[PDB]
Write a protein that binds this ligand. Structure first.
Ligand SMILES: *[C@@H]1O[C@H](CO)[C@@H](O[C@@H]2O[C@H](CO)[C@@H](O[C@@H]3O[C@H](CO[C@H]4O[C@H](CO)[C@@H](O)[C@H](O)[C@@H]4O)[C@@H](O)[C@H](O[C@H]4O[C@H](CO)[C@@H](O)[C@H](O)[C@@H]4O)[C@@H]3O)[C@H](O)[C@H]2NC(C)=O)[C@H](O)[C@H]1NC(C)=O
Ligand SMILES: *[C@@H]1O[C@H](CO)[C@@H](O[C@@H]2O[C@H](CO)[C@@H](O[C@@H]3O[C@H](CO[C@H]4O[C@H](CO)[C@@H](O)[C@H](O)[C@@H]4O)[C@@H](O)[C@H](O[C@H]4O[C@H](CO)[C@@H](O)[C@H](O)[C@@H]4O)[C@@H]3O)[C@H](O)[C@H]2NC(C)=O)[C@H](O)[C@H]1NC(C)=O
Ligand SMILES: *[C@@H]1O[C@H](CO)[C@@H](O[C@@H]2O[C@H](CO)[C@@H](O[C@@H]3O[C@H](CO[C@H]4O[C@H](CO)[C@@H](O)[C@H](O)[C@@H]4O)[C@@H](O)[C@H](O[C@H]4O[C@H](CO)[C@@H](O)[C@H](O)[C@@H]4O)[C@@H]3O)[C@H](O)[C@H]2NC(C)=O)[C@H](O)[C@H]1NC(C)=O
Ligand SMILES: *[C@@H]1O[C@H](CO)[C@@H](O[C@@H]2O[C@H](CO)[C@@H](O[C@@H]3O[C@H](CO)[C@@H](O)[C@H](O)[C@@H]3O)[C@H](O)[C@H]2NC(C)=O)[C@H](O)[C@H]1NC(C)=O
Ligand SMILES: *[C@@H]1O[C@H](CO)[C@@H](O[C@@H]2O[C@H](CO)[C@@H](O[C@@H]3O[C@H](CO)[C@@H](O)[C@H](O)[C@@H]3O)[C@H](O)[C@H]2NC(C)=O)[C@H](O)[C@H]1NC(C)=O
Ligand SMILES: *[C@@H]1O[C@H](CO)[C@@H](O[C@@H]2O[C@H](CO)[C@@H](O[C@@H]3O[C@H](CO)[C@@H](O)[C@H](O)[C@@H]3O)[C@H](O)[C@H]2NC(C)=O)[C@H](O)[C@H]1NC(C)=O
Ligand SMILES: *[C@@H]1O[C@H](CO)[C@@H](O[C@@H]2O[C@H](CO)[C@@H](O[C@@H]3O[C@H](CO)[C@@H](O)[C@H](O)[C@@H]3O)[C@H](O)[C@H]2NC(C)=O)[C@H](O)[C@H]1NC(C)=O
Ligand SMILES: CC(=O)N[C@@H]1[C@@H](O)[C@@H](O)[C@@H](CO)O[C@@H]1O
Ligand SMILES: *[C@@H]1O[C@H](CO)[C@@H](O)[C@H](O)[C@H]1NC(C)=O
Ligand SMILES: *[C@@H]1O[C@H](CO)[C@@H](O)[C@H](O)[C@H]1NC(C)=O
Ligand SMILES: *[C@H]1O[C@H](CO)[C@H](O)[C@H](O)[C@H]1NC(C)=O
Ligand SMILES: *[C@H]1O[C@H](CO)[C@H](O)[C@H](O)[C@H]1NC(C)=O
Ligand SMILES: *[C@H]1O[C@H](CO)[C@H](O)[C@H](O)[C@H]1NC(C)=O
Ligand SMILES: [Ca+2]
Ligand SMILES: [Ca+2]
Ligand SMILES: [Ca+2]
Ligand SMILES: [Ca+2]
Ligand SMILES: [Ca+2]
Ligand SMILES: [Ca+2]
Ligand SMILES: [Ca+2]
Ligand SMILES: [Ca+2]
Ligand SMILES: [Ca+2]
Ligand SMILES: [Ca+2]
Ligand SMILES: [Ca+2]
Ligand SMILES: [Ca+2]
Ligand SMILES: [Ca+2]
Ligand SMILES: [Ca+2]
Ligand SMILES: [Ca+2]
Ligand SMILES: [Ca+2]
Ligand SMILES: [Ca+2]
Ligand SMILES: [Ca+2]
Ligand SMILES: [Ca+2]
Ligand SMILES: [Ca+2]
Ligand SMILES: [Ca+2]
Lengths: 5, 72, 1114
């Protein structure tokens, strides 16, 4: 997703 | 619509039989006139004024022939 | 000692106006001896033959009716005077002979039960009157699996008939269970059949709901209102006060709203609620309901003594009054009286640092170390140390000034620094390297770097350092836990897991962000899971509670300012920064959804500093209203976990465990509330609490080794290797066998090597099978995220009861276990035995396999409405998906509802990049090198980005980490990163091979040829006394390379020298035809190279068909 690292 | 639970049950189940509308409509007219008959039966039952119980046989047999007549 | 910077000793008191220190005896004395009286604050101490007498006469039917019959609710003998004017309408209730049921009717007992409309409006069986569970006599059968709104009793006249009757239609199953069903009717899972028209509709026709499962409902008509659960209703049914679709979508406050007309000026409406011209009032004409405009003509009604009791002040108008309250006082609902405003709670932003409530106005004060500037509200830090920001890029920890003037590297060359924190006591810095899965520390003067934690760190997310109790707290996102340890990295202990709330609705799923508050002994953390929340726990693992749970989707960031004690956090999805009290009350938004993607924020004085992922920027602004927003810096890589380095951000406090470890054996943790302390034990220890002390009794598995002093226990493969791990040194005893393997690797008893995961997995992997030995595996234990079969092999906790043989002996799928086990807190259980996340219940998808997670009757109720702040409701079904999944290029609603009309969806003004299609992607994904829009519009029309300090540029202009340069392998796709190495010096603590390439120094002189040319072994001292370099078991290549004995002349060029393939050695190696056969050149060619078409030996004997075709199909 767009909130992982 | 109808007063009693049993008439509503017959009414949903009659629709579940997909019967013809003219037959299905005649069902309610025979049950709705029985609705007024059952009400005076019930009033005379709880109050106990129907000392002979004459009003019970005449709606029991009417309901039975209604079930037989209309294909239930 | 000296005085803390800008502060005063606890033995004295600080003046507010100038920061000077005076003794406490001058405080609270009544004499303003300070510069502005800050010492003397007010908070201190101060015909008559046809009927009979029992019957009422009637005319037409010649009937006579009892006296109690009439005036009951209907005309008994069709008399028009029966109801209206024969009895008193409400002089009395209908007395005890007929029980009370509505005012216009009455009920004689049993009718409250039978289900017939005997009060005129069905209200006889309302509330909890009667008939909780009806019963069936002879010739009747009960629909036991049913609820009130369907049925509970049916006659035998309908059992095993032609049409289903009960709720689940069990009447037709019974013992009947017929066979005959054809293609003319739809077939259900349970076996019953129904007409094709009764598929994919609003009715549960088959009982089993097989006629509805898997259907795809087309959208409703134009005149058909659609509810959130997917049921179409007539628009006439909307806002008729009847729940026409169950979930209440058609009956809700703001959809069924008719806001009253404004009529702002002139247009003086009267008190009956309709707007009329202003001049009509007291025009001597009664134009409103009841003298609403004519009081004769109005005058002030407060003039008489205490009429309407206007508490503070009053004012009048043409036809009314209105009281008023002085500033600092608010009127309450009675519209007559005023109460004091707690401005410190109702309006926190008025005072910059601290607030004290007064009856009326308020007074703002500053925390010690701060002085209030002459404006009366803005405190200023008094220490002559200027703060600076410390934030982490993926490769760097960088130093940035508060105003942004200076910018420099604190450190570089790291793998991936996702979090960091500082300690002002030792001037030390801590950070988590997510790429290496280690936690390091170093002094701020850039020396004494070391690694304190390197084991069982599956996925660390955020860390926080406790300056008071010298403890280190960090979150793990894979184990879903909150850990604790001393600053040196010992005595690790689990202090939180599973769920937080009493309902198990908010659980550890995606922990991120952490902030300690040692003053009150609390730890605050955030989770961005499906049920996102901000939790709280005591520093010792008590007081689990939920602080924020509403209007929160992606809480990446969290912090506390320590001066106002306000809690601060930011949401990446909703895009806000919002602050609240420590208990979660009185929340206020700083930025109202305008931030692209904040990740970490921090506070100092009056300024909030946050790191933005989408813009890759560090920004600052006012901490209360967001004014003065300024971009400080903008980097190539994403910024993580910014921190303001200043001693005021770690306020001084007494240590409850002072100079004695609190008398605790291993750990002393601050009690919730801060006042007390609690002794604790590490992970593999048992707390045998005694009368006046806690005993930490060691309890470690058979795969673990207990150290000499019982200070810790370590995995069994950490015993007998190169490094001493225990403090005692028993890790490496004198009677220690030779170490054949590398670090972090299990060693077989015969010298073979295998990974630690090979231990007790029931698949023997060592040559001796010692990895599955009874003594070793008898008391094996594994992590909290795994479940252990009776076979003593550990599998992930979610691999149970899935009809897959994850364990060898089906213990995971055994029916006895799959019926008695529970799910872990926060997980839903299926009748199949599956454990699934609670979010997976009622989401259309068949997750249990048995559709147990999708009860259609229950899933469509009001209890599963989507959270309208963050979730988007699918059109044709009851599924809810998060808003960020809307037109992302993937079918998430199972009906493609979320991908419809993305053209109308606007991107966020600054953080997103619109694709060729109408999708919005984060700007950080522009020109990254991979297609994320689904049409390559992001990577088109791009220019390669410039390299940073730790990066190296290939011939293709793409940047790679400098560590990959000259490491024997190419990463640029060509010769670029190994173009020349012979005349280059490489990162420290690395050994450069003679061929120019360089390896980590630990791989030098350890037998294995780690350099390509084996130069890491070609010049080393003699390993064994009598001159030998390898133990006898291994072979010794003439270039001093150690090699496994069975590798001898197997056809692989194993010794880089070539000593492995001498023919004289080759001929005498034992061989076996199915595995190794002799080639006619005396070379035992590997058996896999026979009939391979390749001349592994120089005469083609390995390819001759005579002895490698199939004689018996072999
Ligand atoms: C980078 O910054 C850090 C942090 O400021 C510096 O580390 C400190 O260095 C000073 C020396 O300059 C240390 O001061 C010494 O502390 C000793 C006691 O604590 C040390 O030893 C115990 C032993 O268990 C350890 O537990 C503890 O962690 C410390 O390592 C004192 O005994 C010393 O006293 C001696 O010298 C002083 C004068 O300096 C004399 O007055 C005394 O009589 C005696 O001779 C000394 O005070 C300090 O402890 C260090 N801090 C820490 C946390 O260890 C780095 O030096 C600095 N690095 C660089 C290169 O700049
Ligand atoms: C994991 O690493 C181990 C290392 O030991 C390998 O296991 C076996 O290793 C031995 C190394 O010696 C292989 O060779 C065996 O040597 C034995 C010792 O030789 C005796 O006789 C000579 C005669 O001069 C003496 O000098 C010497 O001192 C000894 O007295 C032989 O006895 C072995 O033969 C017998 O045992 C093996 C099983 O161990 C049987 O397979 C044979 O049929 C026979 O009964 C043998 O020659 C041995 O080959 C290695 N095992 C196997 C099965 O190959 C493992 O190979 C390695 N892991 C894997 C998966 O390969
Ligand atoms: C230069 O130096 C190295 C060592 O510094 C020498 O290598 C040693 O050689 C001896 C003799 O071969 C080895 O001793 C033998 O080891 C066998 C295997 O045991 C291994 O595994 C066990 C358990 O983990 C270890 O305890 C052990 O140390 C080994 O690692 C034993 O099985 C042998 O005993 C057998 O024979 C005796 C009779 O002699 C029987 O009574 C016993 O029951 C048993 O069957 C024996 O102990 C020694 O292990 C080697 N060490 C290394 C590191 O390889 C070189 O030989 C030397 N070079 C020269 C030219 O001399
Ligand atoms: C609304 O009603 C309130 C309640 O009476 C009014 O507050 C009162 O205002 C008067 C005039 O400002 C104050 O009188 C002054 O008091 C001082 C002594 O403190 C005296 O020296 C002056 O000569 C003067 O008389 C009075 O104190 C104050 N009452 C209180 C208790 O605060 C208010 O003025 C009204 N506001 C309006 C706009 O009508
Ligand atoms: C991050 O950057 C800031 C600002 O550049 C650094 O602050 C600097 O810290 C050093 C050490 O405290 C100061 O050096 C001192 O200067 C005085 C006066 O010249 C000298 O007498 C001392 O001997 C010492 O050399 C420096 O002045 C100071 N700069 C500012 C603007 O305050 C900070 O050290 C950096 N942090 C890290 C971890 O590198
Ligand atoms: C977990 O959260 C749920 C949902 O908030 C809690 O369910 C609550 O359960 C009570 C008792 O069943 C419900 O009260 C009921 O109200 C109806 C009238 O609406 C009444 O007829 C019942 O006799 C009963 O008083 C309550 O409505 C419901 N919560 C809400 C807000 O709907 C539950 O308590 C929590 N934890 C537990 C103990 O499961
Ligand atoms: C252990 O956990 C509970 C729940 O988090 C903590 O109780 C909470 O404590 C705060 C502060 O004392 C309470 O706020 C205050 O409540 C009173 C009314 O009781 C109100 O007058 C104040 O204005 C303020 O709002 C909060 O209500 C309370 N919550 C509940 C229901 O327990 C408790 O403090 C924790 N103990 C520690 C010190 O770890
Ligand atoms: C596998 C699993 O966690 N099973 C658990 C069981 O161990 C016990 O905690 C039970 C209590 O209600 O909940 C369930
Ligand atoms: C951010 O990038 C802009 C160009 O878009 C540049 O002008 C600005 O200097 C950068 N911010 C800082 C101050 O580093
Ligand atoms: C829907 O959002 C509004 C704010 O626009 C809020 O007041 C209301 O409570 C929300 N309703 C639901 C279904 O959560
Ligand atoms: C004096 O004591 C204070 C206590 O907070 C600080 O340790 C300060 O650094 C000390 N000053 C000197 C010169 O040692
Ligand atoms: C060699 O020098 C280069 C360039 O100055 C790098 O600094 C590299 O880290 C150096 N390594 C050694 C071993 O000196
Ligand atoms: C090799 O090193 C060993 C280590 O014990 C002995 O010191 C030995 O003497 C060394 N030299 C030779 C020739 O073996
Ligand atoms: Ca004073
Ligand atoms: Ca009447
Ligand atoms: Ca009734
Ligand atoms: Ca039936
Ligand atoms: Ca259906
Ligand atoms: Ca409605
Ligand atoms: Ca008027
Ligand atoms: Ca106030
Ligand atoms: Ca997780
Ligand atoms: Ca959510
Ligand atoms: Ca966003
Ligand atoms: Ca070790
Ligand atoms: Ca194994
Ligand atoms: Ca399984
Ligand atoms: Ca599901
Ligand atoms: Ca989607
Ligand atoms: Ca891209
Ligand atoms: Ca490379
Ligand atoms: Ca090597
Ligand atoms: Ca070989
Ligand atoms: Ca071959």
């Amino acid at each position: 997703x767009x909130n992982x690292x | 619509e109808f007063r009693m639970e049993k008439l509503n049950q017959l009414w949903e189940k009659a629709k579940r039989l997909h019967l013809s509308p003219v037959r299905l409509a005649e069902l309610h007219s025979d049950l709705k006139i029985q609705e007024r008959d059952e009400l005076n039966w019930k009033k005379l039952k709880v109050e106990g004024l129907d000392g002979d119980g004459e009003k019970e046989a005449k709606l029991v047999h009417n309901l039975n022939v209604i079930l037989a007549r209309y294909g239930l | 000692p000296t005085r803390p910077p800008g502060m005063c000793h606890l033995d004295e008191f600080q003046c507010q106006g100038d920061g000077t220190c005076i003794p406490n005896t001058w405080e609270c004395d009544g004499h303003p001896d300070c510069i502005h009286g800050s010492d003397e604050h007010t908070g201190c101490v101060p015909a008559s033959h046809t009927c009979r007498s029992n019957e009422f006469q009637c005319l037409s039917p010649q009937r006579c009716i009892p006296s109690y019959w009439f005036c009951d609710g209907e005309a008994d003998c069709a008399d028009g005077s029966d109801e209206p004017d024969t009895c008193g309408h409400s002089v009395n209730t209908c007395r005890a002979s007929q029980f009370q049921c509505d005012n216009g009717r009455c009920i004689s007992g049993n009718w409250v039960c039978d289900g017939d409309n005997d009060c005129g409006d069905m209200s006889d069986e309302d509330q909890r009157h009667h008939c909780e569970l009806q019963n069936c006599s002879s010739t009747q059968f009960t629909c036991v699996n049913s609820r009130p709104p369907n049925r509970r009793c049916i006659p035998q006249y309908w059992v095993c008939d032609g049409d289903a009757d009960c709720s689940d239609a069990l009447d037709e199953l019974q013992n009947c269970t017929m066979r005959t069903c054809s293609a003319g009717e739809f077939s259900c899972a349970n076996g019953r059949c129904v007409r094709q028209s009764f598929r994919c509709d609003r009715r549960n026709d088959c009982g089993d709901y097989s006629d509805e499962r898997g259907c795809s409902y087309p959208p409703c008509h134009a005149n058909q209102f659609t509810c959130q659960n997917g049921r179409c209703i007539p628009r006439f049914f909307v806002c008729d006060e009847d729940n026409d679709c169950g979930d209440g979508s058609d009956e809700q406050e703001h959809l069924c709203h008719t806001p009253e007309p404004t009529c702002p000026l002139h247009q003086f409406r009267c008190d009956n609620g309709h707007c009329i011209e202003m001049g009509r009032v007291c025009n001597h004409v009664d134009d409103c309901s009841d003298n609403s405009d004519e009081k004769g003509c109005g005058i002030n009604e407060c003039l008489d003594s205490s009429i309407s009791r206007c508490d503070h002040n009053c004012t009048d108008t043409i036809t009314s009054f209105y009281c008023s309250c002085l500033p600092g006082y608010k009127l309450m609902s009675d519209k007559r009286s005023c109460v004091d405003i707690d401005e410190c709670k109702e309006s926190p932003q008025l005072c910059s640092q601290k607030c004290e409530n007064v009856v009326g106005s308020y007074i703002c004060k500053c925390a010690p170390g701060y002085i209030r500037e002459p404006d009366g509200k803005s405190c200023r830090q008094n220490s002559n140390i200027e703060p600076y920001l410390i934030f982490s890029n993926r490769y760097y920890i960088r130093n940035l000034t508060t105003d942004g003037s200076s910018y420099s590297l604190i450190l570089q060359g790291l793998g991936n620094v996702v979090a960091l924190d500082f300690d002002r006591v030792e001037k030390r810095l801590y950070w988590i390297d997510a790429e290496k899965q280690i936690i390091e520390r170093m002094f701020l003067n850039k020396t004494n770097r070391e690694t304190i934690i390197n084991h069982r760190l599956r996925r660390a997310e955020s860390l926080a350092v406790d300056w008071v109790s010298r403890k280190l707290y960090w979150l793990d996102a894979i184990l879903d836990c909150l850990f604790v340890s001393d600053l040196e990295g010992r005595h690790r202990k689990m202090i939180a897991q599973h769920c937080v709330d009493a309902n198990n609705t908010f659980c550890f799923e995606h922990p991120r962000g952490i902030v300690l508050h040692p003053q009150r002994g609390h730890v605050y953390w955030a989770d961005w899971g499906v049920h996102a929340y901000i939790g709280r726990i005591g520093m010792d693992g008590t007081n689990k509670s939920v602080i924020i749970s509403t209007k929160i989707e992606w809480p990446n960031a969290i912090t506390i300012d320590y001066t106002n004690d306000l809690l601060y956090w930011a949401d990446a999805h909703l895009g806000y920064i919002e602050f609240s009290d420590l208990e979660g009350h009185h929340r206020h938004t700083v930025y109202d959804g305008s931030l692209p993607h904040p990740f970490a924020l921090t506070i100092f004085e009056d300024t909030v500093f946050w790191t933005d992922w989408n813009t890759r920027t560090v920004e600052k602004g006012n901490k209360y209203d967001g004014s003065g927003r300024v971009v400080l810096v903008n980097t190539t890589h994403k910024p993580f976990d910014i921190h303001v380095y200043h001693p005021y951000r770690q306020p001084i406090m007494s240590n409850p465990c002072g100079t004695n470890n609190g008398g605790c054996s291993h750990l002393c943790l601050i009690k919730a509330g801060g006042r007390g302390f609690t002794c604790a034990c590490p992970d593999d220890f048992q707390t045998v609490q005694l009368r006046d002390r806690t005993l930490c009794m060691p309890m470690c598995s058979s795969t673990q080794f207990l150290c000499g002093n019982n200070e810790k226990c370590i995995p069994i493969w950490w015993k007998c290797d190169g490094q001493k791990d225990c403090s005692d040194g028993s890790d490496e005893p004198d009677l220690c066998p030779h170490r054949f393997c590398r670090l972090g690797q299990f060693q077989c008893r015969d010298g073979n090597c295998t990974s630690p995961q090979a231990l007790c997995n029931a698949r023997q992997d060592c040559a001796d099978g010692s990895d599955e030995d009874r003594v070793l595996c008898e008391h094996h234990r594994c992590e909290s995220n795994e479940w252990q079969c009776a076979n003593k092999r550990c599998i992930p906790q979610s691999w149970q009861c899935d009809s897959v043989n994850d364990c060898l002996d089906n213990s995971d799928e055994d029916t006895s276990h799959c019926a008695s086990r529970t799910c872990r807190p926060g997980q839903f259980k299926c009748n199949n035995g599956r454990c699934i996340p609670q979010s997976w219940k009622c989401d259309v998808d068949n997750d249990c396999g048995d559709y147990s997670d999708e009860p259609i009757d229950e899933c469509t109720t009001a209890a599963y409405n989507c959270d309208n702040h963050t979730e988007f409701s699918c059109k044709t079904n009851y599924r809810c998906i998060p808003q960020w999944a809307v037109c992302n290029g993937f079918d998430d609603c199972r009906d493609n509802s979320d991908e419809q009309g993305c053209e109308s969806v606007p991107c966020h003004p600054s953080g997103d990049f619109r694709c060729a299609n109408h999708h919005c992607i984060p700007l950080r994904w522009k020109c990254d090198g991979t297609d994320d829009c689904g049409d390559n519009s992001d990577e088109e029309n791009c220019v390669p980005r410039e390299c940073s300090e730790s990066e190296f540029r290939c011939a293709d202009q793409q940047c790679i980490p400098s560590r990959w340069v000259c490491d024997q392998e190419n990463d640029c796709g060509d010769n670029s990163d190994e173009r020349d190495c012979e005349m280059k010096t490489c990162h420290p603590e690395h050994f450069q091979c003679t061929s120019g390439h360089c390896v980590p120094k630990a791989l030098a002189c350890d037998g294995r040829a780690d350099c390509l040319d084996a130069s890491d072994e070609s010049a080393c001292p003699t390993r064994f006394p009598n001159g030998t370099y390898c133990p006898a078991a291994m072979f010794e290549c003439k270039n001093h390379v150690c090699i496994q004995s069975f590798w001898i002349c197997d056809g692989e060029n194993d010794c880089v020298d070539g000593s492995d393939e001498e023919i004289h050695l080759c001929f005498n190696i034992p061989c076996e035809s199915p595995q190794r056969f002799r080639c006619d050149n005396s070379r035992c060619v590997y058996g896999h190279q026979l009939c391979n078409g390749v001349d592994d030996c120089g005469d083609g004997s390995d390819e001759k068909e005579e002895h490698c075709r199939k004689p018996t199909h072999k």
